[PDB]
Design a protein around this nucleic acid. Sequence first.
RNA 1: UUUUAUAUAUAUAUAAUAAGGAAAAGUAUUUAUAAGAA
Length: 134
Amino acid sequence: DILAKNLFDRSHSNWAPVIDRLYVSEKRFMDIDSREFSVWLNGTVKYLPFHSILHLDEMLLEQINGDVVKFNTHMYECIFNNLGNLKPTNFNQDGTNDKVILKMKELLERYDKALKITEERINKVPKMTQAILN
RNA sequence: UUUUAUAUAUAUAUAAUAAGGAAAAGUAUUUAUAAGAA
């Protein structure tokens, strides 16, 4: 029923019902191939609301069992694109307590972690792309 | 472009994928001065 109400209208594809379904569902994203799934998710899922982007973030975490190192480029790109496409809820006068900015630095620090845990394990690697900076 | 996917020997040939969209009104003194004709 979820595919019918929103996805049928080509102009505006609303993926909040879909993400909410797959977050409510116990199966979530586990047991799904990282590669095909990352490319599809990045390609199609855009303009998500903030809470949807959260649920998607933790549920990719649960897909990958919480291994920061495995977390691929396209995964970053999807989360970052959705975060950026969000407009500010309100222009706070100081304008530094935004949620999106904090989650954005959270993801960057997570990347730094993943790199450090990979190097420590030594004792493909993820990359940053112009899309994330943009 | 970039990122990944397959294949082959870190690299090569192919396929797919593209983040840059903002609206608004009103806010003088100029300077020195070079002419040709039969």
